[PDB]
Structure formats: C-alpha cells, structure tokens
Amino acid sequence: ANTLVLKPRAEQDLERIFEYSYTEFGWQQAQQYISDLDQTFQTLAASTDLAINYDHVRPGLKAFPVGAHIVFFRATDTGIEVIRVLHQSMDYPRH
Amino acid sequence: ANTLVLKPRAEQDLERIFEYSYTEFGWQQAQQYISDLDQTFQTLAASTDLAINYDHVRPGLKAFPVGAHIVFFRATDTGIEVIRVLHQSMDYPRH
Amino acid sequence: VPRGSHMSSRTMTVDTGEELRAFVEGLVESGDYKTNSEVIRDGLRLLQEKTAGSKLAALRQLIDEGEQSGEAVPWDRDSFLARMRQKGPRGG
Amino acid sequence: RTMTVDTGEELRAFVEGLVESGDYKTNSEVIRDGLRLLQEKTAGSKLAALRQLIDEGEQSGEAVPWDRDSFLARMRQKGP
C-alpha cells in the first residue's frame, strides 16, 4: 500500500476547504468534496505518471487538479507527501 | 410661504435614499426618513441662518445635515433650491 | 446584548460574479484571510484609498451634475411617497 | 452564488454613499470594484505568492499519515 502523508498546513487547508463548503452547501457536499480529494490522493500515491511537474515553482514540486482545487505534493520513495491544497485561483502554471 | 424647489437629480437622490432605506428597514422606516428630510427642507426654506456656507465647494452653495445625509442647496429670492441630497460620506467639510 | 436591547450588526448580501467569488474563496481557504468579509473589507479599503485624495473634486462633480440635471421643480412629500408605493408592493 | 458580508460601519456607510449618489447601481457593484483592486494589487506576483504558500506548507512541521476517518470525526466534533 502506497504511503500518503500530509504536512500540518495541508491538513489545515483541508479543514478550511471543508468549512467553506459546509457553510455554503452543508455536510453532505463538504464530505463528498473531501472524499473526492481523498480518492485523488490515493490515485496520486499509486501512479507517478499523473503528477504534473511544477519545478518552475519549486524543484520537485508536483501538482494535480481535483474539483476547483490543486493538490501540491512531492513524490516519496513509497508514495506522496502533500504540501498544500489550494484553490485553483492561487495557481501559477508554467510560462 | 417660502419656496422649496428641487433639482431633478436631487429628487432622484431621494428615490435612491428611500429605496436603500426600504431594502434595509421596510416601509415604515423608509417613509419616515423621507418625512424627516421633508421637515428639514421646510425648516431650511424658512430660516436663512441655519444654512452652512459651502462656498469652498461652489460659490453660494449651502449645506445642512439630516440623519446620515446632507442637503446641498442654494438660497433663492423666496426660499431654497435643493441641488443634491448626498450621504455624509461624500462630504468635503471646510478646512 | 443586554435584555431589552437588540443586535445592530449590519450585513450586506452581494453578488461578486463567479470570477471574483473564486478569488475570495481561495484567499479564505489559503488562510491568508479569516473570512469572506475580511477579503471584501480589504477591497473596500483600497477603493476608499483610491478616491480619498479627490473628495473635493468628486463633490463638485456631484453638485454640478445636480445643477445640470434640469430646472428645479416643486417638492411634495405625499406625492413622492405615493409614487414610491406605485413602484410595487411595500411592506414593513 | 452570493455571499453575506459584514463590512463594519465605516465601510458600510462608504458603500451606501456611493450607491445613493448614483455612481454605482448596487452594493454589489461597489464590492466588485474593491475586489478588482485587490486582485490587481497581487496579479503581478502570483508566482511569489504561490512560492510563499508552498514554503509555509513545507515549514509547517513533519508530515503525518493521512487519516480520513479521524479528519471527518474531527469535523463533526466541531459544533456537531
């Protein structure tokens, strides 16, 4: 089983994302959204080729979209390490 | 009776002021606010000494407060001519 | 709030459009701002700052636009309020 | 999709005055003008801003295993 760890601030991002969705759409939508995020985490931990190279932000940084958000992460020997989960409005794609 | 006339734009100011008050507070309070403006109109038309000299904005311009708003007006031979009714946040007081 | 008194907090419900809505959402979710309100207040402070140095010109323009809006006509409170009632149903 | 915001009294009155003067049609138009200014202020340094967010993630402590069940339990424990 591939490993999946989160920086403390990424887990705090998820909490803010959950609360934002909860406040406007209620529990079921917020839980669904975190479920979509969780499913994408597992897919990224299993398949190195999905990761988008974000060296232009930081060397070795990877990105992947889910919904209106972007998982920013790094590859590890056994899986991934999630650094931040940010709204896509924060993105800076490669020039 | 002393004369009281309004520029068309001052009448449109009062409509916007009424609608803003109505949306927030409902009919009774919005009509009362207009009625308080009207009472101030009548008092200004009768008493030249109440007018605040606003020459520093435009020669001959006068001002007077009512609620959160300012009546901007000119003195005429028989009374006053209201030019605008503006929120006090638009004011430029004498320095 | 003391008994017999009421809350006087005053909110406003606004439509930012999708582009600026997503902009606000990202700033809140990043932790840069605590609430939608804080983002909106920062924006409003910038708008207030942009015009803070031209309040005299701005007021002169409002006054001139009143002067140029046509000849002045009599004012009647009851007719005004009647016309407000005719625009649609009124309550409260 | 609207939002309900508390501007505080000073900025609320600022917004009201601009609407009642006729310079802006609605509260929303004033708010959007402010947000456009805030977006423009940072539009030119999105890369630095993203780098800062990433760095703050990197510097936020040792990563820990993701535990979805604990997360959702913590979410319902907050004001059940």
Residue numbers in the entry:
A (entry chain A), B (entry chain C): 2 to 96
C (entry chain B): -5 to 86
D (entry chain D): 4 to 83
Quote what the paper states about this structure.
Recently, PrpTA was found to be a pMBL6842-encoded type II TAS with the unique function to regulate the plasmid replication in Pseudoalteromonas rubra. In this study, we reported for the first time the high-resolution structure of the PrpT:PrpA2:PrpT heterotetramer and two forms of crystal structures of truncated antitoxin-PrpA2–54.
In other words, PrpT:PrpA2:PrpT heterotetramer is maintained by one single PrpAFL homodimer interface formed by N-terminal PrpARHH domains and two PrpT-PrpAFL heterodimer interfaces, which is similar to its structurally relevant complex, such as CvParDE, and consistent with the conclusion that PrpA dimer interface and PrpT-PrpA heterodimer interface with an estimated CSS (Complex Formation Significance Score, calculated by PISA server) value of 1 contribute to PrpTA heterotetramer complexation. PrpAFL begins with an extended conformation (β1) spanning from 5 to 9 aa, followed by the α 1 helix (11–23 aa) and the α 2 helix (30–45 aa). That is, the PrpT binding could result in the dramatic flexibility-to-stability transition of PrpACTD, which provokes the de-tetramerization of PrpAFL antitoxin and the rotation of PrpACTD by ∼80° around the AGS residue triad, further leading to the extra interaction between toxin PrpT and RHH domains of PrpA homodimer.
